[PDB]
Amino acid sequence: APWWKSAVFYQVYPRSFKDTNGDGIGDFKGLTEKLDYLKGLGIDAIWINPHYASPNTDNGYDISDYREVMKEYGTMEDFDRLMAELKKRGMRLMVDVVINHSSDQHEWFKSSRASKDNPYRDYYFWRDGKDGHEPNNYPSFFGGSAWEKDPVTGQYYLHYFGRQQPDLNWDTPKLREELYAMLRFWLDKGVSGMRFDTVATYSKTPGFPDLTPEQMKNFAEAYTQGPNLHRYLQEMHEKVFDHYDAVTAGQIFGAPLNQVPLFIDSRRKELDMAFTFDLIRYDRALDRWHTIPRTLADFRQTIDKVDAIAGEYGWNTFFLGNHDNPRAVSHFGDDRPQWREASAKALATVTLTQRGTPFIFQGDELGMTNYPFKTLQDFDDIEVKGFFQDYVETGKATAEELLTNVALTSRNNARTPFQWDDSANAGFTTGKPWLKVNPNYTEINAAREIGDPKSVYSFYRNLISIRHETPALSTGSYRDIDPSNADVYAYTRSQDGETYLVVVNFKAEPRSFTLPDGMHIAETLIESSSPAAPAAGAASLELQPWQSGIYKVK
Ligand SMILES: [Ca+2]
């Protein structure tokens, strides 16, 4: 097993992690000076969100130069220092790779758009409109049509995401070669990993025919069905990742779960592991903003299916939070004062005992919660603006209805400044933060929790150590004890004759758990919200509200 199967990752959204110069935006020197903190927590590797030159219409995901560092984060020297300081700590760096699209301010697009006949025309998708409208009926994730007309040439360009995020043309060999050289630029600097943003949408459908009514309903899935997708991913592995020791992780958004093995089966020489969307969006509607009621049964059944697509040769990541989703404890736990800490601990136990490489999203180790928006403009984000364009301006929904749902689902919930201490703006900045800090920072902050052995932080820290010292908890088999149970999440992890039992009550009421026949408790490794460990030999557990536990069984 390669190092990454037993690693615990931490995701840093540098823009909201640590500001060191008072401009209100997190930067590299902030991250670097917090490495001791991350090492102390027990982190093996960090994935950072995009760190490249960008106009920031999508906070890093609209890249205007792949070979320069974003001005807000620092200089190339700062990046070099970050890597050096990670390596001194024995820690690895995974960077975000955004090559489905570039900023419209990238010099390639500026050149491409300039005329119909120039050497950069085919680095993007340019097409005549049809019948006085767009080339076809493709919608954008960020509002309106995915085609944007350019008065310079009178043709439309393709953008699945923002209008200022034109899609790169993977059908053009010279463009593919540019991407590979660019990736070598960073890999030559020693980065240890790459995460590929929307890796499944690289291939476009020949001829751009209209989406059928059915496909229009789930266009996200349709955009992942490009017929040259795996050809391209395989070429990239051959031309790039074969020549380095870096680990690769694809964000496979939109793709049906049964296709995931095509990305991660090691024999296929594409990616090493998968970020899948099934679990994190298990309670999201197809419109991507409405919530849908779900139970623990739905939660655990999704995990089981996702675990199954890995098989002997594939590998999954596991995460309950990221920069594109609401806060873990609010989303999956219960963020009310009486249950925030208890449920946050419970989800920690889950995260660090799943099969796959766990990714901890910044702030979740403190039990940070969703933000208490009012209306606009606490919601300033290109995605929400698109929801407004598609659903409110069109009369399909009111602003209150949109805001009611996006209060619960907006990715802005996960982008509020990390809560370091109880000083002004939670010690995140000495100025005014680009996004308001959650007022609960006075209670939920790192300085308070690091000194408290009962804290969510301390629990995550203890779990990370337990996972590090217990091979079965990383690479062991996974078996769900009862996929139909909507109250208590219970499963085993097993390897080399050693079996561990994980038991997590998802209700705020007492519950019981009968171990499967033949199985008894041998040792209790850890528990949360439990006044006392079970007796050695127990065939049953009595669970306090939101109790979690890890036990070795006999
Ligand atoms: Ca700054």
Side-chain angles (χ1 to χ4, degrees), residues 127-136 149 154-156:
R127 297 289 184 277
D128 284 346
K130 291 195 192 172
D131 192 19
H133 60 67
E134 291 81 3
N136 69 14
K149 190 170 181 178
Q155 291 194 301
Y156 293 76

Side-chain angles (χ1 to χ4, degrees), residues 234-237 239-244 246-253:
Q234 283 168 26
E235 186 188 80
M236 181 166 68
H237 187 292
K239 301 211 146 185
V240 187
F241 298 96
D242 226 314
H243 310 276
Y244 300 93
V247 66
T248 60
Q251 177 209 27
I252 316 180
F253 186 78

Side-chain angles (χ1 to χ4, degrees), residues 288-301:
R288 313 191 326 277
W289 60 271
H290 275 106
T291 56
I292 296 180
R294 294 298 174 203
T295 73
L296 172 57
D298 297 303
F299 181 88
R300 69 201 296 171
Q301 288 170 30

